[PDB]
Design a protein around this ligand. Sequence first.
Ligand SMILES: CS(=O)(=O)Nc1cccc(CC(=O)Nc2cc(-c3ccnc(F)c3)cs2)c1
Ligand SMILES: CS(=O)(=O)Nc1cccc(CC(=O)Nc2cc(-c3ccnc(F)c3)cs2)c1
Lengths: 393, 395
Amino acid sequence: SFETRFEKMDNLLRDPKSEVNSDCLLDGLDALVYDLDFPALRKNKNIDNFLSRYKDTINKIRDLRMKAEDYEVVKVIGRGAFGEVQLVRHKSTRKVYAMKLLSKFEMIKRSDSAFFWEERDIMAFANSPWVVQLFYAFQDDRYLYMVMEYMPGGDLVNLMSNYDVPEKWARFYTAEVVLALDAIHSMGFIHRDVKPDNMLLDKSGHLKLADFGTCMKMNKEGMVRCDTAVGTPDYISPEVLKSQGGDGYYGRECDWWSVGVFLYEMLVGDTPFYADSLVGTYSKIMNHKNSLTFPDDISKEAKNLICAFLTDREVRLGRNGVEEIKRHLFFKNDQWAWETLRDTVAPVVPDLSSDIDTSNFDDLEEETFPIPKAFVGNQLPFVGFTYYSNRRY
Amino acid sequence: MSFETRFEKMDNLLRDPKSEVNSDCLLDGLDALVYDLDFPALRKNKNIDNFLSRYKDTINKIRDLRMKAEDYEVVKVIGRGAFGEVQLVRHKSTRKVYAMKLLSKFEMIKRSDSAFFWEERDIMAFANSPWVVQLFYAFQDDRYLYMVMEYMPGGDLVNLMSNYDVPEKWARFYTAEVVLALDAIHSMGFIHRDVKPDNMLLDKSGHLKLADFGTCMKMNKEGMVRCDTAVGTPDYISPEVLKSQGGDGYYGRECDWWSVGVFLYEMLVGDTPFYADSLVGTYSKIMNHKNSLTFPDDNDISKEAKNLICAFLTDREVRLGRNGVEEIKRHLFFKNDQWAWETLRDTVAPVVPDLSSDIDTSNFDDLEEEEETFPIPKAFVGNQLPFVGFTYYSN
Ligand SMILES: CS(=O)(=O)Nc1cccc(CC(=O)Nc2cc(-c3ccnc(F)c3)cs2)c1
Ligand SMILES: CS(=O)(=O)Nc1cccc(CC(=O)Nc2cc(-c3ccnc(F)c3)cs2)c1
C-alpha cells in the first residue's frame, strides 16, 4: 500500500543500523562536496554549479554536526601506525572522553581490511559492562573519530610493569577476561588479538576490552575463513599463524590460547614463547609442545590452566564452551562468584586526582592524498561511519 | 548555542520541507551518485566499485519504495513543450486524479538552461494561495523530473478566448483575478516575466489560478531581477525584458503589468497589439509600442478599457503599477456593481465548467505524438547533479 511504502521508507531513515539513515545520508553529501571541490574537476559545470548551489548549506551542516574542534585535547594516550588515541574534553558539555583517530589517507594507502567497521559496531551496540562504549563516531576529509568512555585505570601492560602480580590478582583478571571474551563471542565475533594492551581498567579497577580492529564475524558453524594471519607475534595461536589459502579455517578457541599467554605473562613475568628476534618467537609458538617451560612459586592449578590453553586447538580447554573454563580448579576461590564478579571490589582500585587524571598513561609526544586531477572518490569507503544523528538509546 | 540546540537545529533541518538538506534531498544526493558512477570505466576505481557494491541492495529498495512514474496511470496528454509534456494522470493506489508536468533531463543538459524548474517547484509547493496551482509531490529518475499538481479542468484562457467574443464585464473579471494572482506571486518575491493566457488556468468553479512558472525569477533586495537568457515568442514580453538580454539591465515587477495590458487588449480586440508574421517583426513593434499601438474603428471598447490598456502599454517609468497594486485596483475600468476585490473569488465566475467526470478533458485540445538519452561516460560527468534536491512530498 501507499502508507506501507511511506512507513517502510520512514523507518529506514530512523534505524541506527540502516545504510540510508540520516547519518549515512549526510555523510554521502559531505563526501561528494569533499571529493568534488578541486579546481581540475570544477572545469565541469555540472560539478561547478552543484558545488556553488550547496556552498552555504554544506558550511551550515559542517558547522552544526560534530567536528574535531568541539573537543579540547588534554593528552595523547596512545599511538599506532594508522592513527592515535587521545584524552579529550567536549568544550560545550565539559564531558571527558577518550577519542581514537584513524588516518583516512593511511587506511586507503594499502590496509586490506575495512577493520574500523567492526570496531564501531562492537562498541556502539555491545551494551556490555565488559566492552568500552562508543558515544559518538564522526569524520572529516582527513580522519575518523571514535568518542569512547575514558578508562582512567590504564591497561594491564602498565599494571604488570609496576607490580609482581600475585596469583589471587591473576585469577581475578583472567576471570574478567573470560567473561569479557564470552560477551564478544555471544555477539558472534572472534577477537583474534587478545593481549594486555587491549585489557583496560575503569575508575573502579574492573576490566573492559578495547581495540576491536581485528574482530571478525563468525559464520553459521562459529568459524572464520582467513588466508592471512592476524594478531600479535607473542599472543598469536599456532592455527592463526599457519592460516593460509589452503587451510585457514578456525573458531573462537584462538582467543582461549591468548588467555593462556596472558596468564603465563602475569605469573612468570615474560611471554612463554619470547625469543630475542621476532622470527624466533614465531618458531617457538609453532613448537609450543617442546618450547613451553616454567622457571624454578606458580601453583599446580595455575600451571595446569596455562598448559590447558597452550595446546593444539583439538585438545584446548574451551573447545566445548566456557563452562569447562569456568569450572577449572584454578578459579576455585572463597572471595567471588562468576555471576557477581564485576560487583566485587577489584584487587587494585585506581586512586585518581581528577576527571582528567592520566597517571596510568605513559607520556607520549601529516601527509594527505594529493589534489586529484580527476574524480577519485577517496571519501566514499567511509560513508555511513557517523554515529550521531541516528543513535540507539 | 548548546550541544542540544545544535542537535535539534540539525534534526529540524532533516524534516523541514523548505530545507536543502532534508531527508528527500539527501536521498536524491545518493540516488545521483549511484546513477552517475555505475559505469564499467569508472568502476575500475575500487573506491567507486566497493561503494556501488555496498549500496547495491539498498539503492534498489529505496528506488522501489519512493514515488516513481509507474505509480501513475496516464489518461491523456494535455500539453507539450520543447523540454517536456503535461499529462492528466490517476495515482493507481489512491485512485486520485492529478496533472503531471514532465521535463527531460537529457534535453535540459543538451540545450543547457537546467535551473528554471526550481522557481516553478517552490512557487507551486509553498505558495499556499487560491491563485496558484498546488504542487502535491515532485519526484524524478535518471531520465525525467515530475511535478504532481491539482488538475484545473476548466482549461485555459486561450481556449476561452477562442470560443467567445469576450464581453467587457468578463474581461474586467479575468483581468482583476490576474492582478490578484500576480500580486500573490510578487508577495512571494517572484517576477513572472512572460504572463500569457496559456498561464491562466480555470478550476472546476471557473476561477483563475496561474500555472507554468518556467520563466519565473526571484527578486533581489531592491525587488529587481536581471537576465541573460533569450526570449521565446515576444507577444506578451515587456520592452524592458526584451532590452535586458545578456544581463544589460535590471528590471522590476512592472514587466508583469505590461503583460496584463497585452491580455486585456487581446480579450477585447481579438488579436495581440504587436503581432507580426515573424518573431523579429513582433519585437520591432513592441520596441516601437508608442507608434505601433492602435485600436480598430469600432465604438465597442469603452473609454476606461482603452485607458487601462494604454496605462499598462507604456514605458516602465510611467506605467500603472510602478507605485504598487492599489493604483491598478483603483483604476476606473474596475468600477462595478457585481464584485469587490477582497471577495472576488467567492463570486460566481462568468463561465462555469460543465464537467461529465473527474477525468473530463473537453476543455483540452487533442494532443498527437523517440527519447534520445545521454551516452556511456568514459569519465565522471555528473549529469544527475543539477537535479539533486528536486524531490518534494506533501503530508
Ligand atoms: C594499529 S592502528 O593504527 O590501526 N590503530 C590504532 C591507533 C592508535 C592506537 C591503537 C591501539 C588502541 O586500539 N588503543 C585504544 C585505546 C582505547 C581507550 C579507550 C578508553 N579509554 C582509554 F584510555 C583508551 C580504546 S582502543 C590502535
Ligand atoms: C517550455 S518547456 O518545454 O521548458 N516546459 C514545458 C513543457 C511542457 C508543457 C509546458 C507548459 C506548461 O507548463 N503547462 C502547464 C499546465 C499545468 C496544469 C496544471 C493543472 N492542471 C492542468 F490541466 C494543467 C501546469 S503547467 C511547458
